[PDB]
Symmetry: D2
Subunit: 500 residues, 4 copies
């Protein structure tokens, strides 16, 4: 309940099929139809070139408004679509890469042509699928629901789940195309009516020359970009949820959140094999939040994996494994909060994944690759949290912080047998978090809870083997997208066949 | 002996593998290498944006020169690349769609990214293959020769040999994309080095509203556009070859050729099952040409098929079958001529594939689909003829004629129990061809020679079943491209395994 | 009698005021009015971005249709406006610089903001005047007729008649702007309603490197480009008028015209003792044409000068002097022919204005300089010949011929004690003109009839002083544009009052 | 800040002639020279298309850096040139309209073509003069100092000292064009070397619909934007000078300035007739600033007028008269402060120029026209204060604040019996100024000090006839621009010697 899709030359027919298995509302376009799920947000506005549609949400309206406001006072009362329409017409499509959010902006032009701009981080992945008709969706399952069990053609698993590094346009669906995040696309049709996408990147590669930014300004920038999101979310939502791990990043977000929201709800998960409760409880107490822990069973851990696969359409094993915890937290917080903040991604920007004390020829490059990889996995899809009535946000994943850190001088990421140095300095400068927390060694979600082990135990493979895990995930991935498995009646106990 | 390829960030190494199975030379680019087959033509030009390359040949230089000459005198002595560069900078990339020929234009810029423009008819089909490295080639086999037998991933034949109509960007190779003919493509790379193709069509769909062009002006245009091709080649050749069938179109081309060249070599093929030799001899006598006839055995018919597959990289059954006769003609003319003209495609423009006296709701739409289908088959590829030292030209296939005929009022294509009415009237005003030829009912190459029946006999199927024929063609296609079969040691007798 | 003007937010009074002195009609536009004289031509076309207007005529429709025909069959029946719209939407504004004619193309966008494109040779000069309201016209007299005598401000004759070489955007009207020929202009208004012309040139300076184009190809191009303008005129007009001087160029046009038209009416003029009749008659008989010479009187010579100034809005001394002869020829045939051809401008392309035997370091530069001068003078305006029911045409002044000669090798224009060497070899090969004509040394219109002497006499100056003669021409130019004088009522009184 | 100029194909003579009257340096360019005064500021950056130059100063670097930082971390250390280059190549030329300052950005293309972008407020006016050579400067007196007294051709005082409504591109100099502020200008040269300015506005008119922005949001916006300019000057400049009149605005600034800087030096002026020292003093106490009043004699006042005309090249009577007070304040602060803040322009944004209690059909339209009027006057010129070693700043004149007030709902600018209502309400909340001050009343510079009276007394005319006052200003203006008068050598006789 959050996704959308559009079909060219489509009618109510093709939509009714979708609506059968998914609830949402249809809407006609000049030459097609637009389907948007129940909990889906959207806005529209008239432009000289046609009607503009903005599907999804914006995370930095404040910044965008401030920008448009330089030349148009009507920027302060503009709805999302009108806001982006102002930037589009004044600064060209490239300006839309400045926007953050799980959005998709497109213009329904009279000539039947669709001009679409995809968000640039992976919050709202969009595919153009060639079925009986051409479909553009941010949820591949919608297409199957409309044209049938065979609509989607999947690639061989031997080819799919083997490598770990892919382009941000990679997709295992042969009869489909993954639109590049942060680019402009025009959906045209040639003389014989065949679909042809014309895409253009909205952002060129940033320099890789070390950024020797002085200490004081750096700290000011970090404080500013981490609080910017929270200040945006401050107005609405009096209460905010936070998956607490007691880790540095998740804890730092809670600290900052304490100064922006009235009430805070912290959640923790772990298995019978291990948990981080001791550290999270320490932060919850220090901040006096409505804390509550939970020890997930094996069945729960697996259910979390397959839920992220279904909802965020993840086919990568590591990603699905990492999401499991988060998905159980959403389930634990359902009905308690409507907004959640995380510390997800910080380790990829400040050097958390680097081994303390180890030597690295080019640590920044190592990190950049990971930042990039999150573009196609589905880790950042928001559909999952949405179906639990949650608007999941990741404060660290902002354009400004990512760009700042992209080539930030390594000495701030790894120095003196430490990691995330500058982030630690900033964290305790807040005088809100306990020293053991601020200086805790990094420990991942799937690691600290031993979810990686629980998963390996059910697949009967070594915790290290992520290719065997991907085989499984890709396997259920196709099963869910082919409609051969309904999220409603599915249990890990009935997936033994997909194991061997 | 005419194809080419480019590899992003490739050394002489990646080329050595190719120059091992094929002949040609490799030149280095800013961030890559360019391989050009032994008998392949190409020119270079220095632009401000970088070094421009023109690989292949131009068919309408005279027209392009006359255009560029409107504002720049140097157009009269510009090489092929410099000529297109003038159009490029003066009228934009769209101006290159005005060019005809088996060419590929591209600019190598310092930034590393190349801007390429593909010819717009299918004379030089270009693919972008994602192997160990990104490859752009107008010959897929070259990539196999470069990285191995597993470089190209082929789709399931059940999915490929089904539908008859395909988009002009269709390709059975999963890890490759067929570049749209008549479009501009910029080959860029993102922050992580991954390849991304930004395409934009150079031409939009023409109008489908009936073109009620008065009789006389129409006849003048037909006289003009059919001769222009011959007036371009006249100064470059004294002798010309012509696959003659005694049909209306190839005979009309011969009549014209006799007025532009010194000697004419007409060739005719057939099987022991049937032939059109009778009609062919009439035209040869009337125009007094150096005529030659040849009966083909089943082995030669099949050999002509698998050759068109290998050289023009054709996987379609009907196309491979049709090319058989032509490929046998090339062998017969080898060493006798260096250029050939045909009447190929005329039936797709003037109503020839229409049934005399039959009623049609939308004849032009029917013809248009056929015209379009030629874009992806490889039937217009030139490599085959080229390897036989022949520059193959199809006079009817010019931009002006195709566009003129696109929506030409149907009463000129089918009327009074006749077809190709306007064309027959035109060929008549020439007073050079016998009436029985000018008004002969149309009969295809694969039909009049019963090649269709012979092909059916070996596959043990029915003449009409081009689905089974495609299975065979796609089958050898895959074998040839994977390098599993060699054109030097392949005979129809050793391919019985692909039939079962 | 074929001019037009456009006024932004004009009222019906503006139009009525104009109609008080000039017959015609006003057509309301989006946010203003468009006026066109009784005998002015104009076509319209509906575009996506608004209504396209094409006022004037096109001289090379055949060539333009051939260009558009490459992709749109409807190009064969498109009106001038539709034809230019096809080129505009397909190849950009730059494509419109490829058309020849005394035209003006503009698009009326609902927002009141029109986009205008001017022809690229000066055949139809266009100004943007800032009176009470903003005007756009190809006739300055219209603004006066509409807003009054004090509408146009003129610069001191001390600054106007001084320098001889000016930019093609030069205008002696301080409150007007001469739109650069061959450029796209966007007429906009800022937030406070002030006019702002955003212009952009559609051409780039051509190369000045010597063109070593061989003799055969060169003669073939001369034949093509010289005969092409006659081919486009053969259809209509059975009888054409030709001002014949007996000069090489005018005679070459008569010979060539004799093989394209049915009836040729040649007209020659001369003053007292100074005439070229002997040579004109030779050609008239050598080609058997309807010839008729007429001796001009003192008053008639001077009147031709004031008429060229009134109609063509010429303020340049030499220009008016030269135009004097042609204006007498138009009157000589004000009802016998509807179309005239001339050899005007030929000397600026082939070196006629060069001194035989003389040595030049850069003759082409000297010539190109003169070619450029004709852009602002008003020599190529069609108004005058129009008001006489004649369609004035100059075969030599085609984009192709001009561009060819631009840097053509000097040995073809001046060599071995001769000039226009290649042009003469061409005429000679026609075996249609007497030797004494093919090699007759260049003699200008104003020189051969001593008009340059007659004009000087009435002013009491020297034949060489054009700075003084320009002061006179500038005097009447101002007078006429202020309506203070009438082309029909030019009494001797006011004449002398203009001498000084 | 300090004047500069560029001369196409300039010679060393030109430069040395300039250094003869004005001290500075000249750096060679691709095809010309670039001069800059001793106190002139400029930075360069190597671009792909050429070398970029940023002459002047940026006032909103932090904001521009916050924009570029979204995609390029290198923006945090880029110089002014590099920073604009970052925005230019990523968001196009339109992006440079988002920057505020007395700057001029231009790119020296290797071919000689110069791409120039002008600031969008009139802070640094730029002209393109056509004298012996072609020039581009922000000081008309530089071209004279290099060409001679006859460089600049001025228009008759009849069409200058009259009209009150001028376009932002208006200039009294006939042979000089005023480059529209907020636009990109490309200085081309056609095939014959003649100059041609191809301009294009970088902004579009903002909507004129009433802005119904609620109270609280509006107040925050006023606060943020009024303080933003001060946060940019906080780091440097420990001390700041503020011309305090005692009015609502200047006082409010002094108030907000006290919460940012360390030491505030307030200055006030007036005449024998009267002054605002009373109110001015109250503010000096409430804030405890370093306030010194100074009465101006008959001279000094008339001197501040001729000073503004020389340095700011102001020719508008009213404009000069207003700047008269500011200049006298600079001299009173020279050596003591390096930066000054003013409440200048506030009345044009919040309605302070409107008559309290009066009814207006469209009060924002009147205000907008005034705002616009300041674009061609020279009021915001910084050259004047610069020479006094002072960086003059006007906090109210920001793109955001201006854009906000443009259509702000009138009830905020004039309700019941008040004006600047919302501004007054804002100042009140600050709790730093006395009631009688916060709710004072509109009182101009030339008014509060009877400066308009003194100026008038020297001309004999009344204090309302600004046509005679402009008559005087326009005369000295021309005198100075010809060097016929010196800034220092201003004989009290030469005043009258002006036929005045
Ligand atoms: N046990 C747990 N309870 C609640 N949320 C958890 C969790 N383990 C992981 N998460 C969620 O997943 C995200 C993942 O984080 P990690 O990369 O391990 C981050 P961490 O919390 O930042 O600590 P670290 O950097 O010290 O390892 C966190 O920001 C957190 O919101
Ligand atoms: O019209 C003008 O010249 C400007 C007005 C006069 C007062 C001045 C100000 O708002 O500080 N602007
Ligand atoms: Mg952790
Ligand atoms: Mg046939
Ligand atoms: Mg002559
Ligand atoms: Mg005041």
């Amino acid at each position: 309940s959050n996704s959308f899709c559009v079909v060219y030359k489509g009618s109510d027919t093709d939509i009714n099929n979708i609506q059968r298995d998914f609830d949402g509302k249809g809407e006609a376009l000049s030459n097609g139809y637009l389907f948007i799920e129940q909990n889906g947000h959207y806005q529209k506005c008239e432009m000289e070139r046609g009607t503009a549609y903005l599907i999804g949400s914006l995370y930095n309206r404040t910044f965008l408004i401030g920008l448009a406001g330089v030349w148009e006072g009507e920027a302060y009362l503009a709805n999302d679509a009108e806001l982006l329409a102002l930037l589009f017409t004044r600064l060209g499509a490239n300006a839309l890469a400045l926007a953050e959010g799980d959005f998709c902006f497109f213009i329904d032009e009279p000539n039947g042509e669709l001009t679409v701009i995809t968000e640039s981080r992976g919050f709202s992945p969009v595919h153009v699928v060639q079925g009986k008709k051409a479909w553009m969706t941010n949820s591949l399952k919608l297409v199957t629901a409309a044209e049938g069990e065979g609509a989607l053609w999947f690639e061989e698993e031997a080819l799919v789940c083997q490598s770990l590094m892919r382009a941000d346009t990679y997709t295992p669906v042969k009869n489909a195309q993954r639109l590049k995040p942060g680019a402009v696309h025009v959906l045209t049709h040639d003389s014989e009516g065949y679909s042809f996408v014309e895409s253009r990147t909205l952002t060129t590669p940033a320099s890789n020359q070390l950024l020797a930014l002085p200490r004081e300004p750096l700290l000011a920038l970090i404080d500013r970009y981490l609080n910017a999101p929270l200040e945006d979310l401050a107005p609405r939502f009096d209460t905010v949820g936070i998956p607490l791990s007691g880790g540095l990043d998740s804890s730092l977000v809670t600290a900052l959140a304490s100064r922006h929201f009235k009430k805070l709800n912290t959640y923790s998960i772990g298995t019978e094999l291990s948990n981080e409760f001791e550290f999270s409880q320490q932060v919850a107490d220090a901040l006096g939040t409505h804390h509550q822990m939970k020890i997930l069973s094996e069945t729960e851990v697996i259910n979390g994996i397959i839920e992220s696969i279904y909802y965020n359409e993840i086919f990568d094993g590591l990603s699905a494994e990492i999401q499991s915890g988060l998905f159980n937290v959403y389930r634990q917080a359902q009905g308690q909060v409507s907004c959640m903040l995380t510390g997800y991604g910080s380790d990829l920007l400040f050097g958390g994944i680097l081994k303390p004390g180890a030597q690295y020829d080019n640590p920044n490059q190592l990190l950049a690759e990971q930042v990039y990889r999150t573009r196609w996995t589905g880790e950042f899809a928001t559909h999952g949290a949405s179906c639990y009535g949650i608007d999941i946000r990741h404060p660290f994943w902002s354009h400004s912080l990512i760009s700042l850190c992209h080539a930030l001088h390594p000495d701030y990421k790894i120095f003196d047998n430490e990691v995330k140095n500058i982030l630690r300095e900033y964290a305790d400068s807040l005088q809100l978090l306990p020293k053991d927390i601020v200086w805790r060694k990094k420990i991942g979600i799937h690691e600290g809870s031993s979810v990686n082990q629980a998963f390996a135990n059910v697949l009967g493979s070594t915790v290290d083997n992520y290719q065997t895990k991907s085989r499984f995930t890709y396997r259920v991935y196709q099963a869910f997208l082919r409609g051969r498995l309904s999220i409603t009646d599915v249990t890990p106990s009935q997936l033994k066949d997909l194991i061997k």
